Amino acid sequence: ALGLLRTFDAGEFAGWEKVGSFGQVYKVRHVHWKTWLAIKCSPSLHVDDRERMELLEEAKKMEMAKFRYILPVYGICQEPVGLVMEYMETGSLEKLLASEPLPWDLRFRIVHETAVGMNFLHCMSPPLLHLNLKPANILLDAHYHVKISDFGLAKCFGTIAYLPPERIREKSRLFDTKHDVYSFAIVIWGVLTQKKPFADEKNILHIMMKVVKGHRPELPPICRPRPRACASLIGLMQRCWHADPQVRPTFQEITSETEDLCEK
Numbered sequence: 540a541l542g543l544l545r546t547f548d549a550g551e552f553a554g555w556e557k558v559g560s561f562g563q564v565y566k567v568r569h570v571h572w573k574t575w576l577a578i579k580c581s582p583s584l585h586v587d588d589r590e591r592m593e594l595l596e597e598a599k600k601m602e603m604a605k606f607r608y609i610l611p612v613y614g615i616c617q618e619p620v621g622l623v624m625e626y627m628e629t630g631s632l633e634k635l636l637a638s639e640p641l642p643w644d645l646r647f648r649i650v651h652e653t654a655v656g657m658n659f660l661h662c663m664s665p666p667l668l669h670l671n672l673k674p675a676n677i678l679l680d681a682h683y684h685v686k687i688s689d690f691g692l693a694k695c696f697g698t699i700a701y702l703p704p705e706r707i708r709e710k711s712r713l714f715d716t717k718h719d720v721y722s723f724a725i726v727i728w729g730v731l732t733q734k735k736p737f738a739d740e741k742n743i744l745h746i747m748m749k750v751v752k753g754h755r756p757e758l759p760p761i762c763r764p765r766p767r768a769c770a771s772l773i774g775l776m777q778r779c780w781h782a783d784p785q786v787r788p789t790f791q792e793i794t795s796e797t798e799d800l801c802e803k
């Protein structure tokens with residue numbers, strides 16, 4: 540797993556340019572490879588053995604999930620302590636959703652590709668739970684294709700909206716695949732509306748409490764350009780954010796439906 544990863548010396552990189560914020564992310568040129576990469580550096584001053592081992596754990600989890608829709612990892616920098624990864628020119632879905640209105644065909648393809656990546660993680664033996672899935676961690680290449688990133692919290696702030704209600708109900712429940720399915724529901728919501736969930740609201744505590752009783756982000760209306768596909772997606776979203784985790788679909792079931800939203 541960690542055998543193929545390379546150690547990078549900071550002299551190998553140039554043109555450091557901030558893109559991130561957690562930890563700072565930089566676009567770097569690898570001078571000998573004549574290509575750009577991304578490096579996420581630690582926020583602290585003293586990088587202890589706890590961090591350096593966790594960073595290695597983060598890298599090994601990414602390498603085990605090599606896939607078309609998962610962000611490739613190249614290795615670690617020691618000079619500044621950082622994880623070295625593929626560069627995704629277009630940045631995050633969060634930024635894309637806030638920029639301009641997206642055509643519906645692209646929206647459906649983003650949802651589908653995100654679902655196929657998540658399905659791949661849950662198909663591993665044992666399943667890899669992402670546990671931090673949100674528009675900020677869904678990255679886009681020059682042609683707007685998805686690769687899932689941020690494996691910092693994966694297991695074999697603004698995150699409250701993506702947190703399943705059972706995680707608010709139970710003091711430290713055991714993590715499962717149904718956690719990611721909930722977060723994905725809230726991702727669908729953001730793609731449908733181009734808004735951040737619970738953006739208007741004053742305090743988190745009231746909404747969190749209501750979320751435990753079955754409250755969710757307000758359903759969007761049916762769109763004019765693709766009303767049928769939009770209705771189907773709204774329906775799937777709703778099943779994916781059901782209060783009972785066992786009633787939620789699997790990503791196997793999700794990917795089957797999101798595929799039909801793309802094919803005309």
Ligand SMILES: C[C@]12O[C@H](C[C@]1(O)CO)n1c3ccccc3c3c4c(c5c6ccccc6n2c5c31)CNC4=O
Nearest residue numbers: 558559560564577624625626627630631675676688689
């Ligand atoms: C912090 C964050 O910076 C932005 C988006 C971001 O996810 C925060 O919303 N951000 C960008 C903005 C504009 C262009 C590229 C990125 C980028 C990249 C990565 C990451 C990344 C990896 C692991 C955790 C966080 C990461 N980011 C990344 C990121 C990893 N690969 C990247 O290219």
Ligand SMILES: [Cl-]
Nearest residue numbers: 765766767768
């Ligand atoms: Cl339609």
